[PDB]
Write a protein that binds this DNA or RNA. Structure first.
Ligand SMILES: O=C(NCc1ccc(F)cc1)c1c(O)n(O)c(=O)c2ccccc12
Ligand SMILES: O=C(NCc1ccc(F)cc1)c1c(O)n(O)c(=O)c2ccccc12
Ligand SMILES: [Mg+2]
Ligand SMILES: [Mg+2]
Ligand SMILES: [N+]
Ligand SMILES: [N+]
Ligand SMILES: [Zn+2]
Ligand SMILES: [Zn+2]
Lengths: 368, 184, 368, 184
DNA sequence: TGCGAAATTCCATGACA
DNA sequence: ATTGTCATGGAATTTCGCA
DNA sequence: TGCGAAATTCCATGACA
DNA sequence: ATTGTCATGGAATTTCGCA
């Protein structure tokens, strides 16, 4: 009610009500002539009620919202109250999308030797060839050497069958994967414990993380499409030739084929590289340890003009699963527990369990 | 003349028959003539088919300048001889009845035969599933003549599963018990 | 065959075979010791045969390809021959994606008055509300004032029904649309001829063009999702309230609501803006023509470091419809007939009819 | 006191019955008391329902400070009276039997009645489909008293379909032929 | 002729099938 | 024959209140 | 000690569900 | 608890051939 506004109308000044304005009463309301015309000045008891009223017309953001108010009312420090109400509007918070981009990406170090890390994804589904339907792609981290296995599903079942042939050659220390259905099975953990293989997983819904392979997938799909122009998509039969193809092909920027990085000698393939013909294997093999280590390795890009990185205990929100239509594209807010690195954090939601996620599926919660 | 390398030559024979495991009866054995690295493909018969079926696999990894083998049915057959000609692979043959691997290969092949029979006694029928694990072994089997396993000579690094179990492999005392009672 | 290489081995120099190299014969081949070791030098009769051989291993691009060759052979101006072969590889040309970005976008002029141009798209399908399934959104160009009509399909049939209510208020001069099934009907042309409405269409597969509305769609879907949190998606009933909502809401950057831009006075809505209370309609209406014309209007962005714009008679290719999987993501090349503007061109394909398309669905054909 | 504006007041009555067109029987008529702009909603009956059904439409475009109307069933009904109270709309009434539009409105309403009967004779039954086109006309009907149509006063611009056909509209000689033979 | 704080304007980010 | 848009919320700028 | 042309390296663009 | 990648083809740079 009345409270502060008496002393105003009385004449003797109050904080944040600038003097040279003629604060009168009229129509039983505390008007004030300002340069834009006369605006009403509602009692602090009503301002929350009003700003909400205004906002709630079209769940408009800060400016949009103040501009509606401006028409009729005036008071001190306006937007401050508007911002209070916006950071309280649950619906605005879970639907508006961001305007703040994620900090620059991390270029983790090239694994040291072959078999230190294996990446694996499933490509598919595809055009039935010989009743097969997916592919299991396995890229060695260090070398980029690559194995393909054509499968009827993207199943723990057939995921295993394959690596059992793979681990004939050698056994890897870690295996990175998408948290997809076939790699998160209980049964797979056992498969890998058995062999003493540490399972490590991309954060969820983020293939940038498994991307050594996601990128080897592009290059695979690419080369078939070339080999199956003007021919029915009978891909099953090329898988071999493709596999061979890529492992034996220069990456311009390294000047080595995945095959060479992994063996140190071309096999009896075409344009087999000669250079080291004349050193004993010993001499070759040591030079390999030499090349392998002194291999190009990219740095982190500059951050965007308006990126954010993630402080601890900050308020942030996870992107909605696969949102339905007419369903907020963001989960309710949550708090950043640990920061595993500028791009990966652990958060607790209101549910509330702990989750490990890419900053890429997070938006900082606007307004605090 | 120039030094010896992995892929320069590939030695093959077939092992079998044997007690069926998931309906395979034969193991194709490929050993790299330089590193003595071993591949084991289980097959259904010593036919030029099941040979090529397998090698098409191996060769999707690496292709050998040369394939040495005895004068078996499958390796002489003009079909195989083509598959080779195609892949640009020179075929090479051990004059009948005088079979000539090499030191390291002769050896490795021996190591293998004993190795199988060692473990496919007591599960003569569950052997298909162990081919992976066997390989891993004979490829991490430290060779007297160098300081090195296949695995290290092939890849130039240390494996993550070492068989520093310098193990007997010989038909150890008890396995002749339920061995010469299963056939004798 | 032999030809040029005799005079070489003989000793007396030839063009582009640099002298201080000891060009001998050996193994019945014209070797040459170069700094990388000795490389064979095949007869010009065989070089095309070779480069193709090399490339065709993995349909590798320029560097990737030369590097395979390098191992064995050498000759003058190498890549030149490699590039010849790449620009001839039909499959490379229709599958590799671009590395050249399109020139900066055009910001066409704000239509002058209301009803000069209407944009229209269909949103959907959606969650059945009252058996309705799509929405027809109509944005006036100049003003941004907007109409919604809930429809059971995205049909010429119901597209018309609606504009027949719309053109009650007034009739527009042009109507812009996506070349979608419902706007390209024969029956619709007739509808619009009848009323003397020029039909003009976005290039195909490019909503940037119809985007005054595509952007009004975002803002629509957004506000429902806010109003239907924790409530079943019964959207049919809000269409009215939403419509009202937006037309009466400030665009921060203009400081006017679409409603005002179109009428010059707020209706009896909340926080109705007062300012012009005191001028006759006449005085208002003229000031409107004033505002309307002096309205913010954005310029063209800077071009990307590596963009292209489209010369005439250039070789370019159209992006594949919705490509299947394992099917080239580009059509065979084609020739730029007319350039309607730096972002829209007319091309003739080998089919070969004339087509009008956004530079955005074109890639310049690599290599010439 | 301040000048007059569009939206300041909205005049309504209902017209009907009439020969059914797609099963409508009534036209709700809204005229802006300033511009004399006209909206025509065809309805099924003069009920507070079908009224509100329509106005809910119009009001999704613009909301009037005031709605003036006679004392009909539908406009008095407490239901409508709420709908108004809700929308913040002042309702306003023409003392029974002494109905008081305004110069411009009185006129425009006249213009309308003659206008309908003019064209729903000869297709008394095809009139629903012409409501669009009718509106367009009475909104581009140049008003004597200003230099302006509704359309121009409402939007401040010139329409793209002008009815500079200063046309008769009066029951022109022949339409009384098959008019007073259809009822008389 | 100049301060501190507020008000305004700027503008990169993202999403419209 | 045609063509991107524009709300949003922190930042950077400009303007206000008082001397 | 320097030219013109070739060879190499650079690096923005895009696509991997 | 974890993390982007890398072929590609014009451009920009560096190096080659000859003086
Ligand atoms: O979206 C996927 N891949 C494309 C892609 C996009 C951006 C990148 F940087 C890298 C790759 C998915 C994928 O590759 N895999 O393997 C999945 O399992 C998956 C599951 C759900 C949704 C998407 C993908
Ligand atoms: O993709 C569409 N809209 C999203 C979008 C993307 C980028 C922009 F800049 C603007 C909008 C489509 C769309 O809006 N409409 O109306 C269609 O008819 C359509 C048809 C086929 C494929 C996509 C769309
Ligand atoms: Mg996956
Ligand atoms: Mg559309
Ligand atoms: N790392
Ligand atoms: N334009
Ligand atoms: Zn809100
Ligand atoms: Zn190609």
């Amino acid at each position: 009610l009345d409270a502060e506004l008496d002393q105003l109308l009385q004449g003797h000044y109050i904080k944040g009500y600038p003097k040279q304005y003629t604060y009168f009463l009229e129509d039983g309301k505390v008007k004030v002539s300002r340069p834009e015309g006369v605006k009403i000045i509602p009692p602090q008891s009503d301002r929350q009620k009003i700003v909400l009223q205004a906002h709630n017309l079209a769940h408009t953001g800060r400016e949009a919202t103040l501009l509606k108010i401006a028409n009729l009312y005036w008071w001190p420090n306006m937007r401050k109250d508007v911002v209070k109400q916006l950071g309280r509007c649950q619906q605005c918070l879970i639907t508006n999308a961001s305007n703040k981009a994620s900090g620059p990406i991390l270029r983790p170090d090239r694994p040291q030797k072959p078999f230190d890390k294996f990446f694996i994804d499933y490509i598919g589904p595809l055009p039935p060839s010989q009743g097969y339907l997916y592919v299991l792609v396995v890229v060695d981290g260090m070398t980029g050497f690559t194995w393909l296995y054509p499968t009827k599903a993207p199943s723990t079942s057939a995921t295993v069958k394959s690596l059992n042939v793979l681990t004939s050659i050698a056994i890897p220390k870690v295996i990175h994967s998408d948290q997809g259905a076939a790699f998160t099975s209980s049964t797979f953990a056992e498969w890998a414990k058995e062999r003493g293989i540490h399972l490590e997983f991309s954060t969820p819904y983020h293939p940038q993380s498994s991307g050594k392979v996601e990128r080897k997938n592009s290059d695979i799909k690419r080369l078939l499409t070339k080999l199956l122009v003007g021919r029915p998509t009978k891909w099953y039969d090329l898988l071999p030739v493709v596999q061979l193809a890529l492992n034996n092909t220069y990456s311009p920027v390294l000047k080595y084929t995945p095959h060479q990085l992994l063996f140190g000698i071309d096999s009896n393939t075409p344009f087999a590289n000669q250079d080291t013909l004349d050193l004993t294997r010993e001499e070759e093999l040591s030079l390999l340890q030499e090349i392998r280590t002194s291999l190009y390795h990219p740095s982190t890009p500059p951050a965007s003009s308006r990126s954010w990185s993630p402080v601890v205990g900050q308020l942030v929100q996870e992107r909605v699963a696969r949102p339905a239509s007419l369903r907020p594209r963001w989960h309710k807010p949550s708090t950043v527990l640990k920061v595993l690195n500028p791009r990966t954090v652990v958060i607790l939601d209101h549910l509330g369990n702990n989750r490990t996620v890419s900053i890429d599926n997070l938006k900082p919660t606007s307004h605090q | 003349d120039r030094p010896q390398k992995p892929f320069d030559k590939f030695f093959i024979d077939y092992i079998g028959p044997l007690p069926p495991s998931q309906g395979y009866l034969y193991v194709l054995v490929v050993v790299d003539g330089m590193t003595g690295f071993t591949w084991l493909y289980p097959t259904k018969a010593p036919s030029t088919s099941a040979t090529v079926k397998s090698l098409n696999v191996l060769t999707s990894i690496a292709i050998p300048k040369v394939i040495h083998s005895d004068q078996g049915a499958a390796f002489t057959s003009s079909t195989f001889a083509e598959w080779a000609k195609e892949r640009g692979i020179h075929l090479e043959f051990s004059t009948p009845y005088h079979p000539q691997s090499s030191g390291k290969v002769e050896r490795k092949n021996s190591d293998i035969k004993r190795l199988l029979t060692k473990l496919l006694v007591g599960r003569p029928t569950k052997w298909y599933d162990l081919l992976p694990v066997v390989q891993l072994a004979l490829n991490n089997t430290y060779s007297p003549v160098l300081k090195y396993t296949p695995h290290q000579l092939l890849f130039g690094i240390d494996s993550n599963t070492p068989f520093a179990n310098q193990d007997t492999l010989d038909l150890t005392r008890e396995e002749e018990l339920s061995l010469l009672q299963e056939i004798r």
